[PDB]
Scaffold this active site. Structure first.
Site, mmCIF file in Angstrom:
data_model
loop_
_atom_site.group_PDB
_atom_site.id
_atom_site.type_symbol
_atom_site.label_atom_id
_atom_site.label_comp_id
_atom_site.label_asym_id
_atom_site.label_seq_id
_atom_site.Cartn_x
_atom_site.Cartn_y
_atom_site.Cartn_z
ATOM 1 N N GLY A 42 39.251 42.893 42.252
ATOM 2 C CA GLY A 42 37.974 43.273 41.342
ATOM 3 C C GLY A 42 37.853 43.636 40.072
ATOM 4 N N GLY A 52 39.684 45.081 36.971
ATOM 5 C CA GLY A 52 41.108 45.788 36.949
ATOM 6 C C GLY A 52 42.099 45.573 36.217
ATOM 7 C CG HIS A 104 39.957 34.991 42.540
ATOM 8 N ND1 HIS A 104 39.479 35.946 42.317
ATOM 9 C CD2 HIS A 104 39.581 33.606 42.889
ATOM 10 C CE1 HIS A 104 38.067 35.503 42.488
ATOM 11 N NE2 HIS A 104 38.264 34.090 42.884
ATOM 12 C CG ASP A 105 41.751 38.959 38.562
ATOM 13 O OD1 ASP A 105 40.842 38.895 39.037
ATOM 14 O OD2 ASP A 105 42.574 40.025 38.501
ATOM 15 C CE1 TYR A 123 36.362 33.034 40.401
ATOM 16 C CE2 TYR A 123 35.762 35.395 39.795
ATOM 17 C CZ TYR A 123 35.900 34.273 40.671
ATOM 18 O OH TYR A 123 35.136 34.357 41.837
ATOM 19 C CE1 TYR A 165 31.726 28.895 46.479
ATOM 20 C CE2 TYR A 165 31.721 30.046 44.272
ATOM 21 C CZ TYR A 165 32.024 29.783 45.785
ATOM 22 O OH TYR A 165 32.767 30.854 46.498
ATOM 23 C CG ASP A 209 35.266 32.142 44.439
ATOM 24 O OD1 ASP A 209 35.987 32.651 43.447
ATOM 25 O OD2 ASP A 209 34.023 32.231 44.534
HETATM 26 C C1 LIG Z 1 34.395 39.710 44.423
HETATM 27 C C2 LIG Z 1 34.604 40.260 45.830
HETATM 28 C C3 LIG Z 1 33.923 40.017 46.772
HETATM 29 C C4 LIG Z 1 32.540 40.514 46.954
HETATM 30 O O1 LIG Z 1 31.334 39.716 47.257
HETATM 31 C C5 LIG Z 1 32.151 41.730 45.867
HETATM 32 C C6 LIG Z 1 33.075 42.023 44.970
HETATM 33 C C7 LIG Z 1 32.903 43.317 44.196
HETATM 34 C C8 LIG Z 1 31.563 43.668 43.846
HETATM 35 C C9 LIG Z 1 30.447 43.132 44.616
HETATM 36 C C10 LIG Z 1 29.198 43.383 44.343
HETATM 37 C C11 LIG Z 1 28.148 43.210 45.178
HETATM 38 O O2 LIG Z 1 27.011 43.986 45.481
HETATM 39 C C12 LIG Z 1 28.234 42.117 46.226
HETATM 40 C C13 LIG Z 1 29.523 41.721 46.611
HETATM 41 C C14 LIG Z 1 30.542 41.892 45.445
HETATM 42 C C15 LIG Z 1 29.994 41.279 44.388
HETATM 43 C C16 LIG Z 1 34.333 42.047 45.677
HETATM 44 C C17 LIG Z 1 35.435 42.565 45.040
HETATM 45 C C18 LIG Z 1 36.364 41.863 46.037
HETATM 46 C C19 LIG Z 1 36.270 40.497 45.776
HETATM 47 C C20 LIG Z 1 37.362 40.395 45.077
HETATM 48 O O3 LIG Z 1 38.459 40.227 45.372
HETATM 49 C C21 LIG Z 1 37.242 39.855 43.659
HETATM 50 O O4 LIG Z 1 38.345 40.213 43.225
#
Ligand SMILES: C[C@]12C[C@H](O)[C@H]3[C@@H](CCC4=CC(=O)CC[C@@]43C)[C@@H]1CC[C@@H]2C(=O)CO
Length: 121
Positions: free
Chosen positions: A29, A31, A47-48, A51, A64, A89
């Site tokens: 996320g 961080g 993953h970080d 990106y 996508y 992803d």
């Molecule tokens: C992007 C991730 C997928 C997911 O859909 C999440 C996101 C965190 C924030 C978020 C805000 C939303 O309202 C829609 C989902 C989403 C945008 C998540 C954090 C965990 C996952 C990840 O692991 C990224 O590191």
């Protein structure tokens, strides 16, 4: 896009991306700093990095397309950014899947200050 990644994660793993992965360890996320806690966190680290390999792509917002061929994720043709984000992803979702066996709830909401240690992509 973030919502698409979320769905791919749920598909692969059965877990909702928020809250199971959105705040996990040092890299998932918002961080990423320090030494990853576990294999799942290492997925987030990679993953970080994935990106980061695409500074003039916008993976939160860029949608996508992908399909399933055997249950396998197959990224479909879009823009170069979309193709590359998809592959990032896809890898992460598969990595989560591969590491469900060591997923630990204790790393959810993990404290930022415990993320020190360093790691080059
Ligand atoms: C992007 C991730 C997928 C997911 O859909 C999440 C996101 C965190 C924030 C978020 C805000 C939303 O309202 C829609 C989902 C989403 C945008 C998540 C954090 C965990 C996952 C990840 O692991 C990224 O590191």
């Amino acid at each position: 896009s973030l919502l698409e990644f979320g769905k791919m994660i749920l598909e692969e793993t059965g877990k909702l991306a928020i809250p199971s992965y959105s705040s996990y360890g040092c890299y998932c996320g918002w961080g990423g700093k320090g030494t990853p806690k576990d294999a799942t966190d290492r997925c987030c680290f990679v993953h970080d990095c994935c990106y980061g390999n695409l500074p003039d792509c916008n993976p939160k917002s860029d949608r996508y397309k992908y399909k399933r061929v055997n249950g396998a994720i197959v990224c479909e043709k879009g823009t170069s950014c979309e193709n590359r984000i998809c592959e990032c992803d896809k890898a992460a979702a598969i990595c989560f899947r591969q590491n469900l066996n060591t997923y630990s709830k204790k790393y959810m909401l993990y404290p930022d200050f415990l993320c020190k240690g360093e790691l080059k992509c």
